[PDB]
Design a protein around this ligand. Structure first.
Ligand SMILES: OCCCn1nnc2c(Br)c(Br)c(Br)c(Br)c21
Ligand SMILES: [Cl-]
Ligand SMILES: [Cl-]
Length: 334
């Protein structure tokens, strides 16, 4: 029988209208730069799947950030670089500077523009109501650009947003899980991090799209405004959906399941069972009332939908009242 097909509502064929060499990363020939150009200064850390350094380009004396890639397949290597080259110059997307290779090891290393140590998770414990709005909007600028260029990020979370609090700057990093969106294509559910995985991924639905990132963004905001890190705290993949069910309710979950003719374990239905919906105001109480407004709760409600097709698009989200003053504020400064 199988499931019902799905299409992205926006940017549906941006790769179809483009030439083959745009999205066919398997046919790309990576002209590898010279490793000697770059000298490592200090270890900025090591991410969930890489090791990252502060570095200096000796050809122009500018600073760069080098990311020595995890022992990974050549299929993933080429996908990421091709996605970064295409997203270059986009608003709030980190820009690939060069790509080099170790002389003896032959392990690849992405080189980027220098931004800042400070990720958005470490900076989240000192943010006003207007700061949440401002930095969420900047993430939507990056999310609408990458969607508009035909790319899902697939790993949107606090750690992958770099933010310079003082200069009002923001970058979305780690595109190594991202992928090009093509209609009719089945996509692998093993992307993102538990707490930010959409219901589509947890119900083993393959034909998802850009809307996945909008789920993840909701997860951040929810945690940001209610100060519950993370807002949906699953222990395993089964439990994550069970936590989500305990907020959005099980009624719309099973409507989502039949609509797309999605199949899953009988015991999942038993595990989930029946549970009532909880209105978004019930996660407010003590030291967070200042962060939660009506426009925040509507916005959040419209992002955290089981049905991926119903979720707000990045552009739609940018038009929400939540940002009304934000878009007006940046029209007299930027
Ligand atoms: O565990 C700490 C790792 C932090 N980390 N991970 N990926 C990073 C990227 Br890409 C850039 Br660019 C920058 Br600047 C930093 Br800092 C990064
Ligand atoms: Cl995939
Ligand atoms: Cl979108």
């Amino acid at each position: 029988s199988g499931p019902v097909p799905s299409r992205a509502r926006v940017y549906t064929d941006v790769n179809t209208h483009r030439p083959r060499e745009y999205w066919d990363y398997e046919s790309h020939v990576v002209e590898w730069g010279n490793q000697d150009d770059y000298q490592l200064v200090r270890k900025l850390g090591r991410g969930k799947y890489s090791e990252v350094f502060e570095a200096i380009n000796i050809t122009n004396n500018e600073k760069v950030v080098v990311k020595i890639l995890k022992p990974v397949k050549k299929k993933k290597i080429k996908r990421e670089i091709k996605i970064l080259e295409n997203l270059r110059g986009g608003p709030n997307i980190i820009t690939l500077a060069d790509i080099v290779k170790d002389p003896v090891s032959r392990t690849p290393a992405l080189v980027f523009e220098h931004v800042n140590n400070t990720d958005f998770k470490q900076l989240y414990q000192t943010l006003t109501d207007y700061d949440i709005r401002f930095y969420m909007y900047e993430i939507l600028k990056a999310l609408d650009y990458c969607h508009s260029m035909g790319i899902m990020h697939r790993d949107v979370k606090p750690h992958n947003v770099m933010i310079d609090h003082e200069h009002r700057k923001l970058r979305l990093i780690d595109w190594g899980l991202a992928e090009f969106y093509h209609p009719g294509q089945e996509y692998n559910v093993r992307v993102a991090s538990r707490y930010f995985k959409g219901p589509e991924l947890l119900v083993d639905y393959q034909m998802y799209d850009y809307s996945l990132d909008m789920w993840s963004l909701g997860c951040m905001l929810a945690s940001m405004i209610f100060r519950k890190e993370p807002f949906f705290h699953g222990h395993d993949n089964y439990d994550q959906l069970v936590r989500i069910a305990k907020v959005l309710g099980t009624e719309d979950l099973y409507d989502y399941i039949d609509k797309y003719n999605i199949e899953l374990d009988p015991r999942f239905n038993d595990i989930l069972g029946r549970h009532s919906r909880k209105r978004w105001e019930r996660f407010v109480h003590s030291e967070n009332q200042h962060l939660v407004s009506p426009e925040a709760l509507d916005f959040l409600d419209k992002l955290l939908r089981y049905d991926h097709q119903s979720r707000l698009t990045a552009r739609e989200a940018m038009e929400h009242p939540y940002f009304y003053t934000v878009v007006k504020d940046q029209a007299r400064m930027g």
